[PDB]
Write an enzyme that holds these catalytic residues in place. Structure first.
Site, PDB file in Angstrom:
ATOM      1  N   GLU A  20      98.753   7.515  72.953  1.00 33.86           N
ATOM      2  CA  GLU A  20      97.631   7.390  73.884  1.00 33.86           C
ATOM      3  C   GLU A  20      97.796   6.240  74.880  1.00 33.86           C
ATOM      4  OE1 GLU A  20      94.709   9.589  74.369  1.00 33.86           O
ATOM      5  OE2 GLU A  20      95.781  10.801  72.952  1.00 33.86           O
TER       6      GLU A  20
ATOM      7  N   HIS B 126      98.633  14.377  78.289  1.00 27.48           N
ATOM      8  CA  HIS B 126      99.458  14.709  77.129  1.00 27.48           C
ATOM      9  C   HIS B 126     100.589  15.675  77.445  1.00 27.48           C
ATOM     10  CE1 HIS B 126      97.488  12.718  73.762  1.00 27.48           C
ATOM     11  NE2 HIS B 126      96.318  13.032  74.290  1.00 27.48           N
TER      12      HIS B 126
ATOM     13  N   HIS C 113      92.419  15.276  80.806  1.00 26.45           N
ATOM     14  CA  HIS C 113      93.180  14.376  79.938  1.00 26.45           C
ATOM     15  C   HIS C 113      94.298  15.109  79.208  1.00 26.45           C
ATOM     16  CE1 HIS C 113      94.061  11.381  76.832  1.00 26.45           C
ATOM     17  NE2 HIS C 113      93.759  12.281  75.912  1.00 26.45           N
TER      18      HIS C 113
ATOM     19  N   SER D  11      95.877   9.531  82.248  1.00 23.76           N
ATOM     20  CA  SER D  11      94.687  10.212  82.739  1.00 23.76           C
ATOM     21  C   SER D  11      93.585   9.251  83.181  1.00 23.76           C
ATOM     22  CB  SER D  11      94.145  11.176  81.678  1.00 23.76           C
ATOM     23  OG  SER D  11      93.689  10.464  80.544  1.00 23.76           O
TER      24      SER D  11
HETATM   25 FE   LIG Z   1      94.410  12.217  73.918  1.00 26.11          FE
END
Ligand SMILES: [Fe+3]
Length: 310
Positions: free
Chosen positions: A214, A174, A169, A233
């Site tokens: 997010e 990110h 992730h 992700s």
């Molecule tokens: Fe995160």
């Protein structure tokens, strides 16, 4: 009285270890619960983060074959979606991450290499984190362009599922967006808004973060693409978020900041940013409504927060 906040980048050391000490891998429903090797491996990564201090190189870890296989599965399945579903900023940087950071299906990138790469792109750096930080502490790091980053990987029995952030992730969700200047400036604005903010406004900023960093979607010319790390992700949700099923609304922070969400299913609702520059200006305007008896700005020359006094 104003909540304490770090005024120098080194002061991130102070609360960097104030994590939820009894982590997700101890839960009976965790994919790795009955695996004592996994449990010890998680404690090994936590100890790295606990002993880390700002300015040090992030310790390199020899990942096990089983961990590399898990990474490869996640990498190969997600990579099939990025050309069509991820925003331009993501697809622009991904070949450079493959070339210079070792983003490949048979290799888990080392955080020190990724951090040096991000520093060259936007000055963002990584700091390993053992587990769940408070929203105040995690968001505060962004004011310094510091991203608190996990180093462990999800359990190999369920490669497409994780109940928590893990390195897949962080690196596939990110890191590519932190390589973009306008996104870096936007996320830093959320961090600056958080410094010394009352708890009630920290939760509002955390909700803004949820619906942007997010699970954000952004306009891209006449199209819409994903930039949120939780979408980038998630193989299933990345495909769903650009389908007809969810509701899309324009990013509008007085509404976004109070919108409810859950963490366990696909989002029923996404907010669409016009651009990262526009989202940044919206965060700056929202920050002006936070009751703080001062203003803040980051000085990247000295890596200190300058606190004026309204
Ligand atoms: Fe995160």
């Amino acid at each position: 009285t104003v909540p304490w906040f770090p005024r120098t980048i080194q002061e991130l050391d102070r609360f960097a270890n104030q994590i939820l000490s009894y982590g997700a891998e101890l839960d009976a429903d965790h994919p790795g619960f009955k695996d004592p090797v996994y449990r010890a491996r998680r404690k090994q990564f936590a100890d790295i983060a606990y002993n880390y201090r700002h300015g040090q190189p992030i310790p390199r870890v020899e990942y096990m074959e089983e961990e590399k296989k898990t990474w490869g599965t996640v990498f190969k399945t997600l990579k099939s979606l990025y050309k069509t579903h991820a925003c331009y900023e993501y697809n622009h940087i991904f070949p450079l991450l493959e070339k210079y950071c070792g983003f490949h299906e048979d290799n888990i990138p080392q955080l020190e290499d990724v951090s040096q790469f991000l520093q060259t792109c936007t000055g963002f750096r990584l700091r390993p984190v053992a587990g769940l930080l408070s929203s105040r502490d995690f968001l505060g790091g962004l004011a310094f362009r510091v991203f608190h980053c996990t180093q462990y990987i999800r359990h190999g029995s369920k490669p497409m599922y994780t109940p928590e952030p893990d390195i897949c992730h962080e690196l596939l969700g990110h890191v590519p967006l932190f390589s973009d200047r306008s996104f870096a400036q936007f996320s830093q604005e959320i961090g600056l808004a958080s410094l010394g903010a009352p708890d009630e406004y920290i939760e509002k900023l955390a909700t803004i973060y949820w619906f942007t960093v997010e699970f954000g979607l952004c306009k891209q010319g006449d199209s819409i693409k994903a930039y949120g790390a939780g979408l980038l992700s998630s193989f299933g949700e990345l495909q769903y978020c650009l389908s007809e099923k969810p509701k899309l609304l324009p990013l509008e922070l007085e509404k976004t900041a109070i919108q409810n969400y859950t963490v366990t299913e696909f989002q029923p609702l996404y907010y669409v940013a016009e651009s990262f520059n526009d989202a940044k200006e919206k965060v700056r305007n929202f920050a002006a409504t936070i009751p703080r008896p001062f203003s803040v700005r980051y000085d990247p020359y000295t890596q200190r927060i300058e606190v004026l006094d309204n």
